[PDB]
Design a protein around this ligand. Structure first.
Ligand SMILES: CC(=O)N(C)Cc1c(Cl)cccc1Cl
Ligand SMILES: [Mg+2]
Length: 123
């Protein structure tokens, strides 16, 4: 059980999403972009992603690892940077701030999970 528990990431990711949903900085990123309201978004962005879609994919069991979750979250940020590339835009700055908060908190989740995989493979 608890040392090197390979399923502990899931709850840790739930908690981290909870903190993201509280952040004012996530507000633009909580819901899918209204694709029928914002017409050229698909002209620019190949794979839209947002935090509600991530939270559901996790709840539904459709992430195999926290690295798969982290890939989707990074896509949220790389999509913002592509759609709102100006350092002057307040949306750009929100995305930047929230991305750095995310990468700080996910860091231990990934390392712990990889350390666990290692242990179990070894033994
Ligand atoms: C997630 C994202 O790309 N946002 C919120 C930028 C944005 C704004 Cl500020 C206003 C209208 C449409 C869009 Cl699409
Ligand atoms: Mg899959």
């Amino acid at each position: 059980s608890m040392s090197y528990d390979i399923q502990a990431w899931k709850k840790q990711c739930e908690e981290l999403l909870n903190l993201i949903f509280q952040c004012e900085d996530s507000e633009p990123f909580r819901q899918p972009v209204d694709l029928l309201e914002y017409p050229d978004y698909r002209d620019i962005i190949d794979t839209p992603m947002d935090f509600a879609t991530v939270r559901e994919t996790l709840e539904a069991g459709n992430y195999e690892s926290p690295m798969e979750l982290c890939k989707d979250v990074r896509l949220i940020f790389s999509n913002s940077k592509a759609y709102t590339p100006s350092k002057r835009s307040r949306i750009y700055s929100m995305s930047l701030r929230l991305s750095a908060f995310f990468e700080e908190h996910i860091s231990s989740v990934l390392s712990d999970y990889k350390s666990a995989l290692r242990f179990h493979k070894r033994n």
